[PDB]
């Protein structure tokens, strides 16, 4: 109940109310926050964090960098999925949430009744949500709004799909990551990060793929010893 500015780098715990200064300037409540009157209730333990837009009118933005495993269908998030079945026109794909999301046979890039896509049960997908809400089952799509799949659609095959923590992704996709840069020097690869803690990787051989997946699922707290160890191993593959 004090000094939102003094705890922008501290560990907040649920229950805590924090209030912000002022006639006023619009702001936004992050994911791990909640609004109680004119105050901000915290709903999840986290190292609080703030940001401001390059302008001076936007006000600001607040959130908590909470680590966890379970995913919740959110809107405008790129997400991997696993087709669980098909009902007539629409086929239901799993995401890792409360319930399975839905696609449409004509959402993929360039499809109509006389041109259906090749999606088989068990096939994995990289889409994004357009209706993600607590009251309605989430529908996803594998096509930008303009009408082109800018990297979406079926993933492919000949790769390894594993699962990690969500904060790990939220960190790796950062433009100032060291591990995912250093890996671009030892051996090539191509990988999909899904904001649901689910990752897909491919390389030429398989030993490399396995070493890479182990690194990624461990890179949250790897020691320099193990770091250069696995780097040397990759260099010797």
């Amino acid at each position: 109940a004090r000094a939102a500015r003094t705890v922008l780098g501290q560990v907040v715990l649920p229950g805590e109310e924090l209030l912000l200064p002022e006639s006023r300037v619009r702001v936004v409540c992050g994911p791990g926050l909640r609004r109680c009157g004119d105050r901000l209730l915290v709903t999840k333990c986290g190292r609080l964090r703030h940001k401001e837009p390059g302008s001076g009118s936007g006000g600001g933005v607040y959130w908590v960098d909470s680590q966890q495993k379970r995913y919740v269908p959110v809107k405008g998030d790129h997400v991997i999925g696993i087709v669980t079945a098909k009902s007539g026109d629409i086929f239901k794909v799993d995401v890792g949430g409360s319930e399975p999301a839905s696609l449409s046979y004509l959402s993929f890039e360039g499809a109509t009744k006389r041109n259906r896509p090749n999606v088989q049960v068990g096939d994995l997908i990289y889409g994004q949500f357009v209706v993600a809400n607590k009251d309605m089952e989430p529908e996803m799509v594998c096509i930008d709004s303009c009408g082109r799949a800018n990297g979406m659609g079926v993933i492919g095959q000949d790769g390894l799909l594993f699962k990690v923590t969500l904060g790990l992704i939220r960190k790796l996709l950062a433009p100032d990551c060291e591990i995912i840069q250093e890996v671009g020097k030892l051996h090539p690869l191509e990988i999909v990060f899904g904001m649901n803690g689910r990752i897909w990787v491919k390389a030429k051989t398989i030993q490399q793929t396995l070493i890479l997946a182990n690194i990624l699922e461990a890179c949250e707290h790897m020691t320099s010893d193990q770091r250069k160890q696995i780097f040397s191993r990759l260099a010797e593959s």
Binding site: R35, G37, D38, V131, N133, D135, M136, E137, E139
Partner: protein, 183 residues
């Protein structure tokens, strides 16, 4: 006035006809419920006998009705509801109705969107059309500007006011939710 019993005869077929809550055996009618009987008379002079348990006597929401309901479940296709007040007389026998996608606004545009018209846990009022056959699924429609949502609670616990046709707001704080506001 006389209360009857599931076995007693009431009249010959030559002195009446079964209307409801009865049955027929050789040359006689026989009640089928514990309740009050009544023999109505048409201009034809041949009476229609019937038996009723007036506790919950009978109700019938006809086509051109105006019935309230509560939005429980929704989908991109339709939104299901429960019947509470048929007009103004409640009915503990809560019937279950449905609202289709296109049958939501008089303009009939396909641009309509449930999640921006309805939400689960709010009261609306609509006009029934089809009774239904198997599950008696009432199908309600709101193709009118004085129809739809009337009361709607906020993000968490606040009741909002119908500002405009597809806007609603809570009086305490400020936040513009989207519905098919009525009137």
């Amino acid at each position: 006035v006389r209360y009857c019993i599931p076995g007693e005869r009431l009249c010959n077929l030559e002195e009446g006809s079964p209307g409801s809550g009865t049955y027929t055996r050789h040359g006689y009618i026989f009640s089928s419920l514990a309740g009050c009987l009544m023999k109505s008379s048409e201009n034809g002079a041949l009476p229609v006998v019937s038996v009723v348990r007036e506790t919950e006597s009978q109700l019938l929401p006809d086509v051109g009705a105006i019935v309230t309901c509560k939005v429980s479940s929704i989908n991109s296709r339709f939104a299901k509801v429960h019947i509470l007040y048929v007009g103004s007389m409640p009915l503990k026998n809560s019937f279950r109705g449905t609202i289709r996608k296109e049958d939501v606004r008089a303009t009939e545009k396909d641009k309509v969107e449930i999640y921006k018209s309805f939400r689960p846990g709010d009261i609306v009022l609509a006009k029934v059309i089809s009774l239904g056959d198997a599950q008696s699924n009432y199908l309600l429609t709101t193709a009118e500007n004085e129809l739809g949502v009337v009361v709607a609670h906020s993000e968490s616990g606040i009741q909002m006011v119908p500002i405009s046709w597809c806007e609603m707001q809570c009086p305490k704080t400020h936040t513009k939710e989207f519905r098919k506001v009525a009137r």
